Amino acid sequence: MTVCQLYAKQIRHRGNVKHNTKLGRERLMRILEQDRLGSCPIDSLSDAKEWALRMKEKGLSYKTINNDKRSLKAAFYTAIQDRKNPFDFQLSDVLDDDTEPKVPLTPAQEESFLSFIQGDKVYQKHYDAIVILLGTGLRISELCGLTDKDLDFENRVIIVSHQLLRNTGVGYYIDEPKTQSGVRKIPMNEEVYQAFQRVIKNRKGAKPFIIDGYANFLFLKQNGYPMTAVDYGGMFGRLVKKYNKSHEEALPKTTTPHAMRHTFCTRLANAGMNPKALQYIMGHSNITMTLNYYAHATFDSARAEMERLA
Amino acid sequence: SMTVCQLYAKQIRHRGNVKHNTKLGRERLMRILEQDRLGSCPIDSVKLSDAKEWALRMKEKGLSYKTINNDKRSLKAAFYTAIQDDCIRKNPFDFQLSDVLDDDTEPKVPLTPAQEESFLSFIQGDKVYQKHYDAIVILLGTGLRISELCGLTDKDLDFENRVIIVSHQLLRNTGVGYYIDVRKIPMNEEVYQAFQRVIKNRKGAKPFIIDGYANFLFLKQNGYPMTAVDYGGMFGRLVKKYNKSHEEALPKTTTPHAMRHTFCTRLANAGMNPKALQYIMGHSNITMTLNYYAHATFDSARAEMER
DNA sequence: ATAACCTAAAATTTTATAGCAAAATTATATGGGATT
DNA sequence: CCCATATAATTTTGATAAAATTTTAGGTTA
């Protein structure tokens, strides 16, 4: 009979969720509890737009305000199933998308970025980690999850069958795909292969660690335990800021561990790699995400291709 | 309460702004409902059992799989509206047709390059159908919808830049007669050399000006423009004559749209670069075009990932 | 004598989707330890 | 400045039918 109580019921309905979801839901539950639109009766469309106006004034980005709306709309979708859905509208009207464009790295930047890492006495230890990302386009947690079992040196193949993440409290835990759709095999090039060989040959001080039958992880922290998402993201934040201070052409504002995946995917799509073959290596279930890396065509473009394949 | 017939009828007025083909498509279902025992059942007393059982009768009656799956959507939206007005609690048509029925739909097989340049050679020689040769080369070289080909006029073409302007389609339905219902296509030399021939060999044009459109490129025997039915019916005769002159017959499902299927496929398997096929085909979503692309395995990626 | 065309009629197919949030990645404040 | 980590914010990612086209039955004509 209130909004805050409503979202609590929607949370108890679909309980089978990962750990990060529970955190993300609590953040929204904290927002509803800290706003006037959280103490009102569900039976009491204009206020939802006003709520969207306040979240924009809080400082939260467009998508952050957008994703939350979808959760509330589902909560009222079930409520109406059990008036009119007050969150049934387009956020594009109330607020504008001030989202930052994730500009990839130009081949000149990468050749200068890697050289900096290699020649930097502080971050040269992560060089082998970065090269593989620009050769496999692995997700950052997929990289941290790799063990000696998931590598095929003889056949040059990376078996991506899991991901290793760590959260506050729960600690380390292994996440796996339900069906065999998640599993994919990524081929190693000479740069990637010889990078893994250096990681294996230079691994030392691995403290005793086993989680759900996984051990001998490749990338470990200085504290003895494997690297996590935060450990690599925070390293990038320091590395890029150090690169920008010594290089005029500062790296893109989105130069994050995921941008290494951006750059990888964008390259192949530009070089004319098979769109479905790219979808596999990327691990996209829906082809739509992969096709976003491909440039929008024109008449001249469509004509050129027709004349190229005539 | 009210029956299903009265609910589907009420859902028809609520959503009126529909084109003629829709009305025809909606009327067929309304005939089915009146014919079926389901149409007389009160909306409230319709259970998931009754909804699934209806799908069985449709197949037993002879209807194809995709036919029953579309009518399922037309009826689901009706109960959905009936559920929105709080007439009833749950929607009986919320289930997968794959569980109750099998998808025995004929696979739409496009023409292989070997079949293509053997099918064209037959048209160019057969006295009865060489008049349509120029038209087919266009359908295969442009990948147009069949009514959109009928719509093409002298004004739509641009021989200077060799581009086709597709902005409309010409339709004909019983009673209404003819009626007109947004992309640009590059014309290859083979398609252009056909287009220049169609105009130079066009005559006996009747007076025809519909919705601001006149001088259609492809005309029937009676001087009036070709329709969708006239081309499909022509293909039913053409294919049957090919199969007698050749041992290895053509695909059973070879139709005007198969000439489009063949174009997109041959383009996709040629590796046509991004979304330019999507632009040349004219799909709203990119997902529709990717269906014309072959499924890739690990081996397909291995060779493609070579650099 | 058989197809070849035509048309009303009944059928099949083509085409259309953001988004009725989860679940990841990234940024930051804090604080201790190694460097310039 | 590096590193680790708790906290928090941002990003990345899972057909509630219209409107066409195809086929077919019946008839005439080449």
UniProtKB/TrEMBL annotation, chain A:
Where does the record place the Core-binding (CB) domain?
1-80
GO BP, one annotated term: DNA recombination
Superkingdom of this protein's organism: Bacteria
Keyword terms, alphabetized: DNA recombination, DNA-binding, Plasmid
Where's the Tyr recombinase domain? 100-307
Q: Does the keyword Cytoplasm apply?
A: no
Is the DNA-binding keyword given for this protein? yes
One GO MF term on file is: DNA binding
What family is this?
Belongs to the 'phage' integrase family.
Q: Supply the name of the protein.
A: Int protein
Its taxonomic placement starts with: Bacteria, Bacillati, Bacillota, Bacilli, Lactobacillales
Which part of the entire sequence is included in the shown chain?
Answer: 82 to 396 of 397
